[PDB]
Structures are given as structure tokens and as C-alpha cells.
DNA sequence: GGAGGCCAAGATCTCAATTTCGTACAAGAAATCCTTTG
């Protein structure tokens, strides 16, 4: 019940409620999310994947493998009878407001074209490419707690095991279909608050000074310029407060810079 | 007739550019020095 996949299912993937059929009583944990059957009420959906493996998917997890062409359009014309699947979308993200239980889908223009009219009635979709997810997140007033999926991808198991509720703008957890180990959440953690304050205070600096700051910090985070050189560049360009507002972590620096150069 | 395998197709996009070690030293003894000188 109170797990990350359940919220995204209720808010976003409940649109294909008609297109699964009834569950089946199961006696083994859902291989996709991995949690225990005790929170499935003893029911589950059996399935066999493209690799011929018997896998049990619970109610909110099985929705990532449902074929609903009459709702989700056709994903590949070579196979008309299998429409877009939530677990197979690559480049498509979403933002799910758990407390409101609503969802907004960030799909590129191609996917939006492939989606039928009936899809938009249940889920509001805004055309945005993979790089434009950050633009929507920055510009639009997010409502927390929320689940921000960045790349539905094709590795549905890793996607569901990477879902994490973003309790506030200080730490928005991106779910990019890559298994969110404790080693790599720095690459999937976005601090919209720090990026927002840095963007607010960057207005005081020239465009040339901006380019200089971004390039210097990027090179430093990639160890392509010595720290003394970067310090000289910051001091000569009066970029000290900007560095003071940057995280010490170089990967977070790169992430927030990537966000900055998108907005 | 079902059940393995081989292939094609699926959304657009991520940023960064590198150049050559260290310089000069030398103690009290069996030794062979020796063999003297002759
Ligand atoms: Zn599950």
C-alpha cells in the first residue's frame, strides 16, 4: 500500500484499469518491486517476459507491462497490436503528486503524436523532451511530496526499485530507470531549492561572467583545470558568492549546472 | 501448434579537450707491497 509504486500507479497508471483483468492469488514476492506479498493482500498478476521468466507483478507494478493500444496508441507500427507500455517508454518522464494523487506526463513530441486523444482526458500531458524535464520542474510550482520519474526507460524492475518520494524541493529524487543504489543517488538527486536560489542570484552577473563561471566549474568538477586556476578565474570575475552557493560535491555541481543551462 | 531463437523497432540528447628524474662522492690496513738495497 504505502510504497512508491502504489502512488504512481494510482495517480498515473490507473488510466489503464480496464486493460489488465482480474489478479491471481500468489504466494511469492513481486519480482518487479520486490516487496513482500503481505502488502498485496495475497493477489498478484502472473506474467512471462520476453526472456521466458515467470514473474509476479502486483497491481501497481503490472501496469508497466499492459498493452492498451486503444488508450496508449501504437508504439511501433511493425507490431500494431501492442501499444505503448508504461514500462517501455524511453525519454518519457512524469511528476506525480501523491497527496493530490494526480500526475503530469512529460513526453516528447513524438510520443504525444503517438498518443490518442482519449489518453489526454485522463492524464494531462505537456510536450517536453528529455532535456526539457528540468525546465518544467524549475519553472512550474511543484507540489510535494511527489514522485518524479525522469526516464521510464525499459528496465521496469530498476525503475520501480528506484522510485523515491520527493518530500520537498531541497531533494527531488529522479527515477531514471537505473537502479537507485545508495552509491548513485547523487546522480539522481536534484536540489531544486539550491538551483532556484543560484538562478535567482545569477541575474546579477553578466552573460560572459555566467559562461565563464559555468565553464570553470565544469572543468573543475571534471579535473580539467587546477583548483588554483579556477580560484583565479572566480576571483578575477568576482564569482565568489556563486561558488559559496555551490555544493562541495562535484557531481551535484554538474547536475545543477546542467539544470541551469537548460533554464 | 506450441516453444525457443534472431532480428527490428522503439523519444530525442548528452559536453570536457591535456607539454619531457639524479651531477661527482671517497680512510686506516695484511698488505703482497716488496723490494728495494744488493
Ligand atoms: Zn510490484
Residue numbers in the entry: 1 to 263
Paper text:
Type IV-A CRISPR-Cas systems diverge from this general mechanism, using a nuclease-independent interference pathway to suppress gene expression for gene regulation and plasmid competition. Here, we present several cryo-EM structures of two evolutionary distant type IV-A1 and type IV-A3 complexes (from Pseudomonas oleovorans and Klebsiella pneumoniae, respectively) bound to cognate DNA targets with and without DinG. The structures reveal multisubunit DNA-surveillance complexes that intimately recognize their DNA-targets to form an R-loop structure. Our results support a model in which DNA-binding is achieved analogously to type I Cascade, while recruitment of DinG differs mechanistically, even in closely related subtypes.
Cryo-EM grid optimization and exhaustive data collection yielded a sufficient amount of particles to reconstruct three structures of the DinG-bound type IV-A3 effector complex, with DinG resolved at ~3 Å to ~7 Å in three distinct states (states I–III). Similar to the type IV-A1 structure, type IV-A3 DinG is recruited to the NTS at the belly side of the complex. But unlike type IV-A1 DinG, type IV-A3 DinG contacts the palm domains of Cas5, Cas7.1 and Cas7.2 through HD2 domain α-helices 22–25, and interacts with the thumb-domain α-helices 8 and 9 of Cas7.3. Moreover, arch domain α-helices 14 and 15 are near Cas7’s WL motif, and DinG inserts its C-terminal tail into a cleft formed between Cas8’s CTD and the palm of Cas5, thereby anchoring the HD2-domain poised for NTS recruitment. Collectively, these results suggest that the interface between DinG HD2 α-helices (α22, α23) and Cas7’s palm primarily determines DinG recruitment. We next compared the three type IV-A3 DinG states, based on a structural alignment of the complexes. This revealed that the Cas8 and Cas5 contacting C-terminus, and Cas7 palm binding segments of α-helices 21 and 22 of DinG, do not rearrange between the states. Thus, the C-terminus and α-helices 21 and 22 appear to anchor DinG to the complex. The arch domain becomes stabilized in state I, as corroborated by the absence and presence of cryo-EM density in states II and I, respectively. Additionally, the arch domain rearranges and becomes stabilized in state I, as evidenced by the less pronounced cryo-EM density in state III. Examination of the cryo-EM map also revealed low local resolutions (4–7 Å) for the vFeS domain and NTS exiting the HD2 in all states.
